[PDB]
Design a protein around this nucleic acid. Structure first.
Lengths: 119, 155, 69, 266
RNA sequence: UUCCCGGGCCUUGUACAAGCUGUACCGGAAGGUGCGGCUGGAU
RNA sequence: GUGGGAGAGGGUGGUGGAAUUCCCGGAGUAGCGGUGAAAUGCGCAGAUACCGGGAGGAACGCCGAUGGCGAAGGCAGCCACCUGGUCCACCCGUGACGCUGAGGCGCGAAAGCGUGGGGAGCAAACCGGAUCCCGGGUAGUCCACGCCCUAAACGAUGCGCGCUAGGUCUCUGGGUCUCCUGGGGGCCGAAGCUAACGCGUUAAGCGCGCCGCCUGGGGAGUACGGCCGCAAGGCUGAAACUCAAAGGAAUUGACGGGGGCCCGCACAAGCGGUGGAGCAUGUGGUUUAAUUCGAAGCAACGCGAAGAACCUUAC
């Protein structure tokens, strides 16, 4: 449809869930894939294998729309960062730029209970 | 073991052909101490291959064995109540062990009635590059290099 | 090596010499420890103050993103 | 887990304080190890122990089998009206009263519901943690006094009979316990009011405990900000200063406030 | 040695022959949770 | 006094960015969040993930330390204004002007209160969800005045001065500059001290001055009286009675959520097996006249019994 043949990939890597969103150069999202899309449930959504499957799925639906090369822009510290990177780099995309872009607070709001006891 | 690395026994070279691999194969065939029966069954296989194929048997033994030599195995690892089937590389000793084992067990499960007949067809088929032993060899082969993500667990 | 090693005479209090001050940052716009910069306590403190001031002027990045995995 | 009453005569002591006789037939909420029911069956015509988990029923099959008074009943204490089982089983019984052996963990809902049922009976004697012992006997002042205090004292008069230290309970509770007696009052302690609004007011005053009565009323009570004047107005009538704290007032004056406020904005 | 079972030699201790503490609150109180502190507790 | 030095010391006035939440669009669909298993909860009125613009209210990531400043409590984004303590160099000035200090007067983490505002997030109480967790959530955490004035308020070590080996690291001054000389912060250790552990020029050593406090444990920081406070409470502070102990540090042990190492067909690498089927034996129950008795995890069970038709035999 868009046939821009080049977008960007935002990989939201959480401990519980892994989401990948492919967007146009402008930043408007083109398509998104999750762990629930594959139908996987419970704790095992954080398993690397599920993230691999989501990544491949997103790649296929992307090539469906004319994609060739993207910029991977990884976010968060999910259990499946590097594996999804490896999957998508060799998924058939001519990926140009990969950058870690984890949004860390500059010591702002006070975190929840389990994130306390800081050193 | 814990202290030893364990030394491997050296099999006595065959009487007829003057080789050890035949001895190992017949030993794998050998059950209940019936070494005479196993040897005769093997020699009947030798006669079958010699009659049905012009070439000398021994070359075929080696090349078929190679045609049933696994080269990439999967090993179980216990990480935090989870299983990691890491693909590793096998030793030549391990290669031959699994080779002989798989060949023999494949030979035994053939539809034919006579042992010599079964083992003969099995070894010829393994020679050509297609058979139960071969099939399972590539089975475990393709099972490996599939868990490459789990390849960083060096076991 | 160390950052101090690959530099000649300069003023540590100048909050406009970006050409040199950029060096004292990581791939990300983070101030390197005394392990990396190779400075005594006093000079490290004064440099940190200068870097903060420069950031506020908008000459230096508050943060960046590393071009790696 | 259950507190192993290794010491002897303690059960008898709590019984004596309870004044359960041959004439009296008493309900036990928690069968436990049968010892409490053992003395209860000894000196009473009829005693029943309610079982919530039939897994726990087999034990008495050797303990309370020798005793014939005990009528084992399998029904959840919360999921029943005790009145019906009283009418049926304890028709022969004269005086209706309760002795419990709960794990100090489940007491409050049970003891509150018992009183909710408006069930006519002699009373209840229970052992529980010191600080939770109806928040002691409790009085219209001090830290102990709470909403629970007001509710319990409204239904029934209160008295703590005994305090029991360590070495009495084998799985050393790291906390001391105490035994309290409750006797059902002839109707409400209060003269008259609406129950719902009264309990709401009681809860509202004690929400932010440290803050004044006036602030507790303005905040905790629904709306309240708009009608604040009226609120303070009634406080002038009922002779109570807003600068008093809820803890300071007594139950009767709580009710006197309830009646005033009920006719004002409710 | 990845584990699992049973030992041997070490090192370290609540307890024997995590814990504690100041306030505040508990209509699920062998006690729990806020807020802060301490080592008279192991990385 | 003169010439400088270092610093999260304090108060006030401004302004920088990252992040979280909420309101808008551009775009874009089917789940999102959660643990130990989910569940509750949110989303087809379009939620999550995304880019752009706004509204805020709190805290300042790297630097950052084993570091610095303060009398303590405590204090870190940056700029400015006002202000306190302190260190060194010259050895210029006064001429004992000194130290401690019962009462008094100030300051005093967090929590808690009164009068107003504020509230992004976090979260007592409370409302739900599965069987010590997970969703929501008022006070509070914030600011401005006035209260309260307590702690494992700790170096569990009152303040001042003089004397008694050194070695090493670290911060900040001076010089003639990897060698000296000051002032702080740690480690090892002379002599010495201590019940021991340990302290040891930053004394718990050797001495002098002043202050507070102690006299077996529990009752008890309780009662009573008094003084403070809006309240919570704080300060001061007994006895009746009861036990012959309470307690300090250390030494052998045996036990643990403990951790390290080293082994044994312990797992792994294989082979052959009962568990499923027909029989033989042994037990637990059942049965009867009795089917005698011992042995019950490994370390009881083809064990005593290594020969029950009568014998044996004990029922």
């Amino acid at each position: 449809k868009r046939q821009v043949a080049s977008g960007r990939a935002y990989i939201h890597a959480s401990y519980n869930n892994t989401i990948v969103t492919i967007t146009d150069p402008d930043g408007n999202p083109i398509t998104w894939s999750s762990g629930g899309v594959i139908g996987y449930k419970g704790s095992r959504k954080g398993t690397p294998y599920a993230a691999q499957l989501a990544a491949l799925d997103a790649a296929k639906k992307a090539m469906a729309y004319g994609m060739q090369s993207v910029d991977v822009i990884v976010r968060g510290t999910g259990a499946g960062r590097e594996q999804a990177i490896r999957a998508l780099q060799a998924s058939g995309l001519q990926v140009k730029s990969i950058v870690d872009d984890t949004p860390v607070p500059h010591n702002g709001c006070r975190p929840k209970k389990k994130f306390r006891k800081a050193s | 073991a814990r202290r030893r690395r364990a030394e491997v026994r050296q099999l006595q070279p065959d009487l007829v052909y003057g080789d050890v691999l035949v001895t190992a194969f017949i030993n794998k065939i050998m059950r209940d101490g019936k070494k005479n029966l196993a040897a005769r069954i093997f020699y009947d296989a030798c006669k079958i291959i010699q009659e049905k194929t012009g070439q000398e048997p021994l070359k075929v033994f080696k090349q078929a064995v190679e045609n049933v030599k696994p080269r990439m195995e999967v090993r179980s690892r216990r990480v935090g109540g989870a299983n990691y089937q890491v693909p590793m590389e096998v030793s030549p000793r391990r290669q031959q062990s699994l080779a002989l084992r798989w060949l023999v067990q494949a030979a035994n499960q053939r539809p034919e009635r006579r042992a010599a007949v079964r083992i003969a067809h099995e070894l010829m088929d393994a020679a050509e590059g297609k058979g139960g032993a071969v099939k399972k060899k590539e089975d475990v082969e393709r099972m490996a290099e599939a868990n490459r993500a789990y390849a960083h667990y060096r076991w | 090596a160390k950052v101090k090693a690959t530099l000649g005479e300069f003023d540590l209090r100048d909050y406009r010499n970006v050409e040199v001050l950029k060096r004292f940052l990581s791939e990300t716009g983070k101030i390197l420890p005394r392990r990396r910069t190779g400075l005594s306590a006093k000079e490290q403190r004064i440099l940190a103050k200068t870097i903060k001031r420069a950031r506020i002027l908008g000459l230096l990045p508050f943060t960046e993103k590393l071009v790696r995995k | 887990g259950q507190n192993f009453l290794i010491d002897t005569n303690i059960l008898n002591r709590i019984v004596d304080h309870a004044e359960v006789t041959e004439k009296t037939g008493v309900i036990e909420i928690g069968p436990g190890i049968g010892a409490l029911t053992e003395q209860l069956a000894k000196r009473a015509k009829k005693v029943v122990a309610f079982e919530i988990d039939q897994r726990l029923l087999p034990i008495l099959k050797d303990t309370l089998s020798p005793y014939e008074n005990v009528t084992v009943i399998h029904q959840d204490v919360l999921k029943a009206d005790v009145k019906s089982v009283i009418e049926e089983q304890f028709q022969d019984c004269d005086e209706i009263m309760v002795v419990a052996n709960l794990p100090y963990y489940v007491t409050t809902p049970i003891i509150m519901k018992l009183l909710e049922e408006h069930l006519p009976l002699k009373g209840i004697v229970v052992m529980l943690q010191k600080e939770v012992a109806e928040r002691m006997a409790a009085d219209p002042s001090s830290k102990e006094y709470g909403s629970l205090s007001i509710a319990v004292q409204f239904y029934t008069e209160a008295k703590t009979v005994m305090i029991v230290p360590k070495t009495v309970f084998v799985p050393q509770p790291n906390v001391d316990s105490a035994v309290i007696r409750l006797i059902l009052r002839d109707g409400p302690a209060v003269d008259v009011e609406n129950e719902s609004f009264f309990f709401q007011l009681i809860k509202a005053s004690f929400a932010q405990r440290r803050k004044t009565l006036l602030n507790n009323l303005v905040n905790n009570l629904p709306e309240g900000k708009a009608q604040k004047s009226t609120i303070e107005q009634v406080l002038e009538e009922t002779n109570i200063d807003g600068k008093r704290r809820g803890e300071s007032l007594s139950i009767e004056e709580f009710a006197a406030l309830s009646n005033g406020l009920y006719k004002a904005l409710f």
